[PDB]
Amino acid sequence: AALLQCTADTLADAVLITTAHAWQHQGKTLFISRKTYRIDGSGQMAITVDVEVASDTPHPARIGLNCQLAQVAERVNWLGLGPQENYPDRLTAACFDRWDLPLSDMYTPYVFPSENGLRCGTRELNYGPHQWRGDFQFNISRYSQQQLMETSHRHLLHAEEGTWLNIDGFHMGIGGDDSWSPSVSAEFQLSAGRYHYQLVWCQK
Amino acid sequence: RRDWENPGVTQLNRLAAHPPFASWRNSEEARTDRPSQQLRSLNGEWRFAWFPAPEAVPESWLECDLPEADTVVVPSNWQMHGYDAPIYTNVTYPITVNPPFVPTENPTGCYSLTFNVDESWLQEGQTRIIFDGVNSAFHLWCNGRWVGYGQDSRLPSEFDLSAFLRAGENRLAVMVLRWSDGSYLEDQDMWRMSGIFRDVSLLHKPTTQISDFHVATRFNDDFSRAVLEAEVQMCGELRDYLRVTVSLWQGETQVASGTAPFGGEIIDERGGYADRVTLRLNVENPKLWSAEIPNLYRAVVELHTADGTLIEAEACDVGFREVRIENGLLLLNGKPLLIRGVNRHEHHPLHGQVMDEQTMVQDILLMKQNNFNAVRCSHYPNHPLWYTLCDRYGLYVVDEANIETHGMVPMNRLTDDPRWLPAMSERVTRMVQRDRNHPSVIIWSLGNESGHGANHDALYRWIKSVDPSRPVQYEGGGADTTATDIICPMYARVDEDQPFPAVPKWSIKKWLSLPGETRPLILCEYAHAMGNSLGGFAKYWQAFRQYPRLQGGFVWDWVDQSLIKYDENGNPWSAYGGDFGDTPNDRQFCMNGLVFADRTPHPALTEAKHQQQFFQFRLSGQTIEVTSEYLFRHSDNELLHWMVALDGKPLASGEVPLDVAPQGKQLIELPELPQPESAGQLWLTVRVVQPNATAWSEAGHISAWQQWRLAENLSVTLPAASHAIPHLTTSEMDFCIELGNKRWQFNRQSGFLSQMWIGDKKQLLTPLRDQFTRAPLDNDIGVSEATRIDPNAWVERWKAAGHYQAEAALLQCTADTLADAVLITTAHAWQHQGKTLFISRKTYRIDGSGQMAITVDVEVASDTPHPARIGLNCQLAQVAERVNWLGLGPQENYPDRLTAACFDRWDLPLSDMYTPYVFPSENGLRCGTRELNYGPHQWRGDFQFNISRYSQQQLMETSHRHLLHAEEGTWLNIDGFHMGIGGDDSWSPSVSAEFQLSAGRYHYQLVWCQK
């Protein structure tokens, strides 16, 4: 990430932080993320995200935010599709409702580890003292994406300090018509060029 | 005898039907298709008088010109002369349904003609008269004496006048009835007119003559050898010395000739036809006919004496081609066709149903220029010249019997009744007898929309038995009955089933594979081009390409059936149903074409041309792969032009020769490029160009094109810093923003930007506000009507929900000052009787440079019908001459109808940004736009828009284009999102789900600035 801009402004009833970053490679600009963070008198932080994806780069696996929370809590409660793991091209069986499970159930122990546990069409996620509202997809667990990537067997995984949260505005399909050639259908590829999503983070 | 109220009587004294004749008395003339001294036209000025019913006609008329008659041009439709009104009704018959009766008030046209006949015509031989088209029934007298009677408005009626004429002056009298029992089989969706509307001629033939002749062509497996077989029949006295010679010419070269005396092979226990003879000519390596290369030969049939005196000669153009269905595919010359067709009614805005050579040729060329290769004669045999033009310019034709009984209940009420078999039969048999020698006719059709009755099965069989060279099709009764060789549905969708009882319309992909089915499928009608339509056209093409047995279709239809009317002040305008006092009527349903009545194209025609391209393309790296879809020709009149441009700015370009075999591929490696001097999207556009003129096109004609996005350079560099800083003035009713010579006013009570100035010049006539509706297209309205609402119609759904009446309620309007800009934030709710339909949240941010960035986030209740659009609208104070944009164009294009548009920088006169649909509606949108310029204004983002002198309100409140009036200033509609237009049919919702705005939440952003 290359910082293009970062500015703060005071509003009548809020503070407004605007940022813009570029991800580039070998001089090519892959994505541009432009954001605003508006913090109001109520303690709510509204994050608006607008991303640009170069038409000539391979469509990305996801368009989201990620962070590692200090907090390790017992349950995860959400208003969205569930209760089991579901992806854009595999979410018909999931149901929209209020679900609440123990943290470990939000991790799926595939023998060969990979991205896992996503839950789509969520409008509210609650974990510990935190609350995220919007219309997004998310996964939450004790294993970083980096660690999943680097580890070939589930028994060699180690819970990291804290909890890793991956909150996506958009996520690519997982496919499966076969497992030896690209099989994610065009309609589940993130080829829009321009993507927007908005999240509000607040405590309890 | 009231013969016009009896389906048992369809004619009296009418001669048998036969292929086009001219009785040449010179072989060379027949060979070259020159005019014949023996075939005279009686067209021109005749006398005509109108009466309200046959009973009102005075007997004196039979012998004397009526002084009150007028002199008029024939052929003609009397409605076009103003004698009575033409009627526009679709399905419901224009007369009470009570077969075989017709109204006692039955408009009657009394035509007469005084003309001369050479004594030579009477001293020997036979003189007959031929009426190519009389609608719908008539009696004929000659010199005061009755000759005969005829029905079937679309085939020629011939009578022998030899015993009625005199050398010198003669007088014909023709009493034409508007309505007859024949009207029950003539219920086609088109204007109901009447009259002698096709040519009148006199033909002289010798007493001993050629009475009919049939030509066939059969081939070997590889088409390297043919046998042409000509069966010739005679009438008149047989003599041993008579002979028949059939000769076949290829240009000026004679390829073959055979001669034989009359006397056919034994047929049965009783012998053979002493009055017939069949000649067989061998042809090596024949030049095959197709729509791609319409090679033609000329066969000349000479009747003569053994000593060599010519009696007469007849002749026809021959196209060597085989039509057959095998293994589920329709093959032409052994290869599978892909029918790029269109249905074409015979219609002229000034002359009604009278056809002329110039208009036909016009039609043909435009069809060919727009990639069509086939036409369906909806829904009757056409004027004879049509077939000759199709044979020579090369178009595949579906010849269809003049039988349509759509208004019956149930539809097959007459077609299943044996009492009507006779009348039906002649409409089919006489067509086959007239048209069977035309190579362009590849398929026969039993008619249209007359259910499926036992009469169709018998006639299907009659054709199969008499003319095995062409398949038979018929859509009635569910499109896959026993009376059809081809599954030929009308308006069946690509993927969506429409499971109506008894006659479902399955998805065409699914239909092919139903248990036990194996036939090819070609839609007889699809992509109902009514008004702003053709949404989803590409979906069909894609399917046709992928599925071998989906062999194409015939779009409905070629040309709008609008008619010219003159305002009080003599100004012509386009009229539709009801416009002549005709009632009941079906209004604008007579207008469904790809071109307006004057042949100017509608925007959809370009979508068709594009999807019907004959060259397909693929891009990989710097390699262009061109695939030919031609079946028979090499690309010998084509080159490929390619261009690369960065956001409209030309970068590199070039041309390459195309040398692709039919069905073959050609790889073209593009040069290395001098990559963009900066940010933006590089676009590659390729066009196939025919350098040389052809019979149907000019030099440089563009036949196909395609585009691809190549490299994109996202901009990361920040614009410089403007020292200038915008100022905010607040009052209780308004928020104001000023920046140098610029100012913006946002109204605090409305929450909208109400005014803007450049200098002291006000820029807006009406404030900038959200817009969620559109003046309804014909597809949006369907068959709904004020006196008969169709609740299912999109328009009724939007109306019912309050979309057209919802009012904006302000929920928030705030102003903030940033470091370098003013930020205005608004939120509105649109409601209707308690319900919140839509929510629009926006921010307007005005910086030091005078750019206004507008962010819009809209919520749409999941339970209200999907909106027609999500956008903004305003009336600008200025009217500029041009409109310039970087986006798709140049023609109007919608979400489900934009494949043919290309991304580039376009610039047009404002008037071309408005599409003049006769029935006005939302029109002229351009999609995928990144920049729009008009006057001093500039809008940037990723939106769709339309710009014109007509408000949406006016468009929806006006039924005819001629009545629109340019308002002050310019109406601009800039949409973040816009619903598809649909068109699979125009009587039920047809916009595919992927084109409905059902997302719930939508975001778009625009920058508005002045230059």
Ligand SMILES: CC(C)S[C@@H]1O[C@H](CO)[C@H](O)[C@H](O)[C@H]1O
């Ligand atoms: C209106 C439909 C119920 S019937 C529909 O009407 C169209 C109107 O142009 C065409 O005439 C079609 O052939 C006919 O099926």
Ligand SMILES: [Mg+2]
């Ligand atoms: Mg009759």
Ligand SMILES: [Mg+2]
């Ligand atoms: Mg009909």
Ligand code: NA
């Ligand atoms: Na892994």
Ligand code: NA
């Ligand atoms: Na096909």
Ligand code: NA
């Ligand atoms: Na119609």
Ligand code: NA
């Ligand atoms: Na060529």
Ligand code: NA
């Ligand atoms: Na209108």
